[PDB]
């Protein structure tokens, strides 16, 4: 198929991102994604654009109310080897791994993929140079002049069981403001990961699991503030994520998860953070729909954060699925921030209890708009669908007096493909 058009109508309700402390969303929008694909022997090329119009600045994809954008544009060469799962891709492209915790984003990259039955491997380099959007003229400061280089290798050591290692390096080439006029880093994540159909919603096994452990090292120049100077320090942090899923039958599943990113230490030196390319969204509940690993509402980054998780899920053939997820969150170090949550409000010193969340995702998949698993737009939308995604967050003692007791973020997406 050489071209198509994705049409999405989205409503978003958000209340209240700052828990009532500062001066919400209740809005609707349309999202149009024309795409083009060509293939000629070992060569191929792809483009997807995006046009959005909304009643306010809503999230239509996991600024002005309306804008145009270039989502993906790449050329691909598959001829280095005869293995069909092996190819080299150049351009702004979808980078993804199954957990979503290392990379899950569209970014300018050169990425080599090698995927066979017994051995998987990948290697790439990436950097943002623009938003390619009509409404945003500049890059985020964290992204400006930051280069990513990464790789992984893994093998299937038994049927349905994979073991692997993964590396990522981020280098900041920018400079901090001189005194009188938030950080630059060189950071390396080195991870091991074991999975037993962790993200395979079609598993034939009665039990599935994931386990991963990641060591973060390198250093950060933190700007102190008008700037007054800089603090440098080595980083030596550690992250872990574990989960177990019971495949009760063809339809019912349930499971438990635990994750922890280290925190604090002298000037935040024992503070884990993620690569900045992660989405934290995955099929961990065992359905075709991806779920935010740390809540649709809270949207935690694994950083001075401990989370315990429980979920249940239901699906009927390829027609429906649904998931219900509960999370409880604690800070690891009670005098340090958690960073990168879906909540913009200050924490009270000495309190670890971040809060609790309940999530619900419900999807009906329509017969029209079926895609090949090859496309990058198949992970989120395998065909037309209608989906509700909602999260209810109850702030704990760490947020303290005069904050709302409850906050929610909910979405409906209706998607039709031509
Ligand atoms: C401006 C208000 C116009 C749109 C009003 C409501 C549409 C949003 C519905 C919330 C989506 C469901 C979550
Ligand atoms: C939540 C954890 C759920 C565990 C389900 C265990 C199997 C239930 C027994 C069904 C027969
Ligand atoms: C530096 C990155 C380079 C990325 C190249 C981006 C190209 C984006 C889309 C190219 C679309 C390719 C199909 C269109 C085309 O070339 O014509 C082919 C015929 O129409 C069909 O055989
Ligand atoms: C493949 C394993 C699947 C297991 C999933 C759920 C695992 C839940 C707990 C395992 C151990 C986690 C420790 C929980 C805990 O409170 O530890 C204390 C922290 O280390 C304090 O920082
Ligand atoms: C089967 C469980 C159903 C609920 C699961 C997760 C909840 C998902 C969406 C909650 C719907 C909106 C709740 C409204 C609410 O509690 O807060 C209102 C304001 O946001 C309070 O600031
Ligand atoms: Ca507000």
Residue numbers in the entry: 40 to 62, 65 to 103, 121 to 239, 247 to 290, 298 to 490
Task: Give the published text.
Briefly, the structures include 18 antiparallel strands (S1–S18) that cross the membrane to varying degrees, nine extracellular loops (L1–L9) and eight periplasmic turns (T1–T8). The cavity within the AlgE barrel has been proposed to act as a pore for alginate, a random, linear copolymer of 1,4-linked β-d-mannuronic acid (M) and its C-5 epimer α-l-guluronic acid (G).
For all in meso structures, type I packing was observed, as is the norm for crystals grown in a lipidic mesophase environment. Interestingly, we find that L2 and T8, while ordered in some crystal forms, are disordered in others.
